[PDB]
Design a protein around this motif. Sequence first.
Motif, PDB file in Angstrom:
ATOM      1  N   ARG A 103      46.062  31.180  59.729  1.00 28.99           N
ATOM      2  CA  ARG A 103      45.391  29.977  60.201  1.00 28.99           C
ATOM      3  C   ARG A 103      44.068  30.262  60.896  1.00 28.99           C
ATOM      4  O   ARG A 103      43.218  29.368  60.961  1.00 28.99           O
ATOM      5  CB  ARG A 103      46.295  29.207  61.173  1.00 28.99           C
ATOM      6  N   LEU A 105      40.780  33.278  61.818  1.00 29.14           N
ATOM      7  CA  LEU A 105      40.092  34.473  61.344  1.00 29.14           C
ATOM      8  C   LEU A 105      40.449  35.704  62.168  1.00 29.14           C
ATOM      9  O   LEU A 105      40.437  36.821  61.639  1.00 29.14           O
ATOM     10  CB  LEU A 105      38.579  34.249  61.363  1.00 29.14           C
ATOM     11  N   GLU A 183      40.505  14.866  81.903  1.00 30.27           N
ATOM     12  CA  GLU A 183      41.035  15.186  80.580  1.00 30.27           C
ATOM     13  C   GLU A 183      42.447  14.639  80.408  1.00 30.27           C
ATOM     14  O   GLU A 183      42.787  14.098  79.348  1.00 30.27           O
ATOM     15  CB  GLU A 183      41.016  16.700  80.354  1.00 30.27           C
ATOM     16  N   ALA A 187      43.570  11.856  77.613  1.00 39.48           N
ATOM     17  CA  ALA A 187      44.701  12.052  76.714  1.00 39.48           C
ATOM     18  C   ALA A 187      45.702  10.913  76.843  1.00 39.48           C
ATOM     19  O   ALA A 187      46.292  10.476  75.848  1.00 39.48           O
ATOM     20  CB  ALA A 187      45.375  13.394  76.997  1.00 39.48           C
TER      21      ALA A 187
ATOM     22  N   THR B 146      40.513  27.932  81.566  1.00 35.40           N
ATOM     23  CA  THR B 146      40.787  28.644  80.327  1.00 35.40           C
ATOM     24  C   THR B 146      42.093  28.127  79.736  1.00 35.40           C
ATOM     25  O   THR B 146      42.754  27.249  80.300  1.00 35.40           O
ATOM     26  CB  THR B 146      40.851  30.158  80.562  1.00 35.40           C
ATOM     27  N   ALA B 147      42.461  28.681  78.586  1.00 37.92           N
ATOM     28  CA  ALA B 147      43.691  28.305  77.900  1.00 37.92           C
ATOM     29  C   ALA B 147      44.082  29.378  76.891  1.00 37.92           C
ATOM     30  O   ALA B 147      43.280  30.249  76.554  1.00 37.92           O
ATOM     31  CB  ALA B 147      43.526  26.963  77.210  1.00 37.92           C
TER      32      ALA B 147
ATOM     33  N   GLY C   5      39.400  24.922  74.417  1.00 31.96           N
ATOM     34  CA  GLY C   5      39.545  25.991  75.379  1.00 31.96           C
ATOM     35  C   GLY C   5      40.195  25.578  76.680  1.00 31.96           C
ATOM     36  O   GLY C   5      40.406  26.436  77.546  1.00 31.96           O
ATOM     37  N   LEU C   6      40.507  24.297  76.849  1.00 27.18           N
ATOM     38  CA  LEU C   6      41.227  23.796  78.009  1.00 27.18           C
ATOM     39  C   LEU C   6      42.709  23.668  77.681  1.00 27.18           C
ATOM     40  O   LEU C   6      43.107  23.566  76.519  1.00 27.18           O
ATOM     41  CB  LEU C   6      40.671  22.438  78.447  1.00 27.18           C
ATOM     42  N   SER C   7      43.530  23.678  78.728  1.00 29.48           N
ATOM     43  CA  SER C   7      44.976  23.577  78.584  1.00 29.48           C
ATOM     44  C   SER C   7      45.481  22.141  78.626  1.00 29.48           C
ATOM     45  O   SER C   7      46.683  21.919  78.452  1.00 29.48           O
ATOM     46  CB  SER C   7      45.670  24.391  79.680  1.00 29.48           C
ATOM     47  N   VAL C   8      44.602  21.166  78.855  1.00 33.11           N
ATOM     48  CA  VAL C   8      44.972  19.757  78.908  1.00 33.11           C
ATOM     49  C   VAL C   8      43.950  18.958  78.107  1.00 33.11           C
ATOM     50  O   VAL C   8      42.905  19.469  77.701  1.00 33.11           O
ATOM     51  CB  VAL C   8      45.056  19.226  80.354  1.00 33.11           C
ATOM     52  N   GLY C   9      44.267  17.689  77.885  1.00 35.36           N
ATOM     53  CA  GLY C   9      43.382  16.811  77.152  1.00 35.36           C
ATOM     54  C   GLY C   9      43.546  16.938  75.648  1.00 35.36           C
ATOM     55  O   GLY C   9      44.419  17.644  75.132  1.00 35.36           O
ATOM     56  N   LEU C  10      42.679  16.226  74.938  1.00 34.81           N
ATOM     57  CA  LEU C  10      42.696  16.252  73.484  1.00 34.81           C
ATOM     58  C   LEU C  10      42.118  17.564  72.962  1.00 34.81           C
ATOM     59  O   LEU C  10      41.216  18.156  73.559  1.00 34.81           O
ATOM     60  CB  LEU C  10      41.904  15.073  72.916  1.00 34.81           C
ATOM     61  N   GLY C  13      43.913  23.939  73.874  1.00 38.37           N
ATOM     62  CA  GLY C  13      44.454  25.200  73.409  1.00 38.37           C
ATOM     63  C   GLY C  13      43.407  26.296  73.380  1.00 38.37           C
ATOM     64  O   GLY C  13      42.213  26.072  73.560  1.00 38.37           O
ATOM     65  N   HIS C  14      43.900  27.510  73.138  1.00 41.14           N
ATOM     66  CA  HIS C  14      43.039  28.681  73.047  1.00 41.14           C
ATOM     67  C   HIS C  14      42.005  28.498  71.943  1.00 41.14           C
ATOM     68  O   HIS C  14      42.310  27.991  70.860  1.00 41.14           O
ATOM     69  CB  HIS C  14      43.893  29.922  72.779  1.00 41.14           C
ATOM     70  N   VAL C  16      39.872  29.397  68.967  1.00 44.45           N
ATOM     71  CA  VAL C  16      39.806  30.291  67.820  1.00 44.45           C
ATOM     72  C   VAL C  16      39.048  29.576  66.710  1.00 44.45           C
ATOM     73  O   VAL C  16      38.967  28.347  66.672  1.00 44.45           O
ATOM     74  CB  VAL C  16      41.206  30.721  67.324  1.00 44.45           C
ATOM     75  N   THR C  17      38.484  30.365  65.801  1.00 48.58           N
ATOM     76  CA  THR C  17      37.776  29.814  64.646  1.00 48.58           C
ATOM     77  C   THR C  17      38.806  29.477  63.577  1.00 48.58           C
ATOM     78  O   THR C  17      39.266  30.349  62.838  1.00 48.58           O
ATOM     79  CB  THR C  17      36.721  30.787  64.127  1.00 48.58           C
ATOM     80  N   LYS C  18      39.168  28.199  63.494  1.00 47.55           N
ATOM     81  CA  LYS C  18      40.224  27.779  62.586  1.00 47.55           C
ATOM     82  C   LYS C  18      39.844  28.085  61.143  1.00 47.55           C
ATOM     83  O   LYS C  18      38.685  27.951  60.744  1.00 47.55           O
ATOM     84  CB  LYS C  18      40.500  26.285  62.757  1.00 47.55           C
ATOM     85  N   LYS C  19      40.837  28.498  60.362  1.00 51.42           N
ATOM     86  CA  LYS C  19      40.652  28.882  58.971  1.00 51.42           C
ATOM     87  C   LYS C  19      41.471  27.962  58.081  1.00 51.42           C
ATOM     88  O   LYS C  19      42.673  27.781  58.307  1.00 51.42           O
ATOM     89  CB  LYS C  19      41.068  30.339  58.750  1.00 51.42           C
TER      90      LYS C  19
END
Lengths: 200, 147, 98, 50
Positions: A103, A105, A183, A187, B146-147, C5-10, C13-14, C16-19
């Motif tokens: 999913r 890279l 945030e 949500a 961060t997350a 990059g945040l743990s809350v909200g829309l 999550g961490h 990453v460059t989605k593939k």
Amino acid sequence: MKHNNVIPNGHFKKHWQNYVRTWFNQPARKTRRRAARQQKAVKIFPRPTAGSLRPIVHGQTLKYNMKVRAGRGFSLEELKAAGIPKKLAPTIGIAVDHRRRNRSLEGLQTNVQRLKTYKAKLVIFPRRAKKVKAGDSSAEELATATQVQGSYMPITREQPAVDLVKVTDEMKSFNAYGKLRIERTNARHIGARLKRAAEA
Amino acid sequence: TTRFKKNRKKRGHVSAGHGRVGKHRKHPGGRGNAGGMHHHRILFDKYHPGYFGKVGMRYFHKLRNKFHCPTINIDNLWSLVPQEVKDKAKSSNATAPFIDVTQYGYFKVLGKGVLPQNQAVVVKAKLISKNAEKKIKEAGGAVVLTA
Amino acid sequence: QPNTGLSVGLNKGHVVTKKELAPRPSDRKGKTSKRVHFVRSLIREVAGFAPYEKRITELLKVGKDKRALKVAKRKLGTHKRAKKKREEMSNALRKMRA
Amino acid sequence: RMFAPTKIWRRWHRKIPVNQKRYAVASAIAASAVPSLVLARGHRIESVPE
RNA sequence: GUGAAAGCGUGGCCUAACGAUCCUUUAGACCUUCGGAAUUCGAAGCUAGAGGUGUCAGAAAAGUUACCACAGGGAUAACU
RNA sequence: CCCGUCUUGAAACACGGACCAAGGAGUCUGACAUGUGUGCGAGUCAACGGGCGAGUAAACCCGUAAGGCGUAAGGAAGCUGAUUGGUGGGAUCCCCCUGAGGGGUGCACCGCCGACCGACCUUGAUCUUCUGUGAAGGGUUCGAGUGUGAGCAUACCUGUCG
RNA sequence: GCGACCCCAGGUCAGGCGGGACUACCCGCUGAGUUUAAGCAUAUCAAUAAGCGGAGGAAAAGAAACUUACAAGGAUUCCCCUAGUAACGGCGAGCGAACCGGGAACAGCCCAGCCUUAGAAUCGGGCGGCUCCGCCGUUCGAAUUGUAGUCUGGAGAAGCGUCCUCAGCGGCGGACCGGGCCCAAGUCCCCUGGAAGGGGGCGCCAGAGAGGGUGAGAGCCCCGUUGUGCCCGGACCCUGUCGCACCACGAGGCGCUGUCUACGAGUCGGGUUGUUUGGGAAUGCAGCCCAAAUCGGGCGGUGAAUUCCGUCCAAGGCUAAAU
Ligand SMILES: [K+]
Ligand SMILES: [K+]
Ligand SMILES: [K+]
Ligand SMILES: [K+]
Ligand SMILES: [K+]
Ligand SMILES: [K+]
Ligand SMILES: [K+]
Ligand SMILES: [K+]
Ligand SMILES: [K+]
Ligand SMILES: [K+]
Ligand SMILES: [K+]
Ligand SMILES: [K+]
Ligand SMILES: [K+]
Ligand SMILES: [K+]
Ligand SMILES: [K+]
Ligand SMILES: [K+]
Ligand SMILES: [K+]
Ligand SMILES: [Mg+2]
Ligand SMILES: [Mg+2]
Ligand SMILES: [Mg+2]
Ligand SMILES: [Mg+2]
Ligand SMILES: [Mg+2]
Ligand SMILES: [Mg+2]
Ligand SMILES: [Mg+2]
Ligand SMILES: [Mg+2]
Ligand SMILES: [Mg+2]
């Protein structure tokens, strides 16, 4: 029942005495497993005793997604990117998993680099001694070939480091708690906001 | 240790310490937690308030991993910094240590206690309490999400 | 959408460059060859329609779409399959009319 | 049948903390260096050089 | 509320006139949740009452045995 | 007056006991709890497993972001999350004088009253993605909370329970 | 009347298969009550005992119509933890999993369907040979109401390039296992004893002072014990080396494609009833009723409608190890 004690809830109302498992064979089991490992190592000589190479994968769920562990086998996409045919990988000590999806890279690139390192570190004997084929190694490499006992490619975490950085005014004027609260509110109210926008 | 058991001291005393009148019978008050409402009501009420009844909503197939959230107080943040990094931070006032509490297994930073005096600290965490952020800002540091 | 990059909200999550997932044969599970469609059409011509399909078609011809859907739901069991069956009956009726 | 027949799932083994084991080993090693204690344990060490 | 006002009034001049858990039902919030994401029904929660246990600290309960049985009781009747 | 037993009361017209030998009944295990001994300590626990090793069921060694308990609590939940005390007694010690004296010191524990976190209520300048934030200001309400940790492992007796 | 086929009947016809026995573990069915709840009926005892069947050295399970919602894992099985937790329960007595995470072991595969039609290329029996667990030749039969071959979604068919890979035999050893033969030292002196193997003195072996026997506590009397050496036989499996021919038609590997791309039905699913499960507007199973679909179908632990999203592909089959 009497006095101030925790309320007992022992689950001992069935014929539990007929389903007791003791561990008096634990040393025997350890010895048997060691003997099996030694026999396997003798059988697969000079192949590494640690087994086939495994991919690097993330932990599942929010509790372990920061952790890196060993997966079942390399994905078809990773094998294709590394140039290793999927039908050949199992025969040269590379585990294959046709189920794992890629999913992001980062994971694919990490596993491709791992496969490249394994290929660089791999020595392959020819099927026939007097015949040398495309994937076979040179006689010099074959001569200095030995069985590796431990894990040849440990999967290790990058240890944490605390660095000293300059605190700029932009960081000094950032409201982390306010950002988190807003945030969360967004949500929570996205559905109502979308409904109102659609209505108007 | 059988030789230390008090029944050994009671050899030759007839009742084995359980009384001539009352005696030691099989289950004079029922088995386990029997009679919690009828003849053991006083014990349950005085020692186990809240035992009977139900409160709150149910949660079918509840997984604890999605609720995982370790917390660390600001009074424990300094203990995460290695000694050499602490010495460097003390020596130089133009930079602040950068502690990623997530690498140590902490998600949220709470605000109990105080920080080292006149020490700026940059803290990165998934979540933070308002008081912890206020204390970090007062110390001259900053907060990163961060997350 | 990329993670914030945040743990809350829309879109939390961490980062990453989605593939995009690589295509695989399992993307065609719901599809079949043209030969299978031809065979099914021929066998439908040979075998006709079941009595409840005929009842649904009669209801649709009269104009009782809601009653047709109710009958289909009672016969098949679920609202989704009932909707599919009613749509197929409607397509057959349209073909017959044309 | 005997009263309370013996059973195999009696707690035969013990789990002593490693630190206490190491403490005991160090104490025994230190005691082995005391000639008075070695004599007191029954060993004939009257002829050992040191 | 009443009285001009102090003041009195949180039921009946005082001493009795009444009721847990579980479940149901009603009232209250621009309240919480249905755990992949939204909206709407439905359901589940929070606070306060109501439907009752009169054996009233609150099992859901008809007889007979001379065809009778067991554990006990001189803590208890039928002689002296 | 014949012992044992139940009993308000037994030498009893109360039951067991003709006699002797051997056998004969609070145990083992699991979950807790107080107490005590031992180790370490904001940690503690290698015995699931692995490396070995008395040629060996022992002993020894090994925790990667493993796991258990502890290290934070309050709410049904969404969720939020400890601003770091005062005072009256009080042990020990230090000074002046030799009175049941005065001054300083004030750990443990106890009494009293604040403050902080959270459920509930109340309150509202400024910002803000318009529903969030929170200057100031609170409460005869509620908590198995905070206010410079006290736990973890292990041994045994005792107690409740299966 | 003859002939072809179909269904069926009789054969002590030629050649095969099956029944029954054992119980510690294993698989399927059926199935209580004592008991606990201080009574008792739901519950508990227990998805247990008893009862009826079926295997092996293990069985069973097994290659996702999975877990999850993550930065995602990836057949099955087992251990630790999850956890006496979520849940279930006259919400009483009680009962009670799963995922993640750490370990043991690891292994993947075979079919059905459209695709020989320049000929069923497939298989069984008899007979005759051979380096005989099989191969060859010939002759009958099975099979077109379909045996071989290709294909199984991870793909694949077809077409075009790349020139990357693929063909046995025999000898001698090693590894594993099961056995056979030999190999150390006092029975010295004195005493008590029926008998030294006891006491005292003097010697010896020890990679052998485990154990047993012999007239009493025996390292050196005997068998053995320790460590070498030599000898014999299985398993044809793994492994090293050596001797000879080593043929790429064909099939795979890799790249490309404005073409195709076939996937299991009274089955899934639904209603209802019974049972079971922690599974709670219903966890699985089963009877009866209804009864599908292919830009579709199952699942996403609160029933329902709408719009998306995530994940897999059932209704066919095999498979060692950890236990
Ligand atoms: K107690
Ligand atoms: K007692
Ligand atoms: K007594
Ligand atoms: K509920
Ligand atoms: K009044
Ligand atoms: K009563
Ligand atoms: K009766
Ligand atoms: K008595
Ligand atoms: K008597
Ligand atoms: K720990
Ligand atoms: K609440
Ligand atoms: K033939
Ligand atoms: K075929
Ligand atoms: K297919
Ligand atoms: K299939
Ligand atoms: K059914
Ligand atoms: K779907
Ligand atoms: Mg009593
Ligand atoms: Mg009431
Ligand atoms: Mg951990
Ligand atoms: Mg099997
Ligand atoms: Mg626990
Ligand atoms: Mg696991
Ligand atoms: Mg033949
Ligand atoms: Mg004798
Ligand atoms: Mg000898």
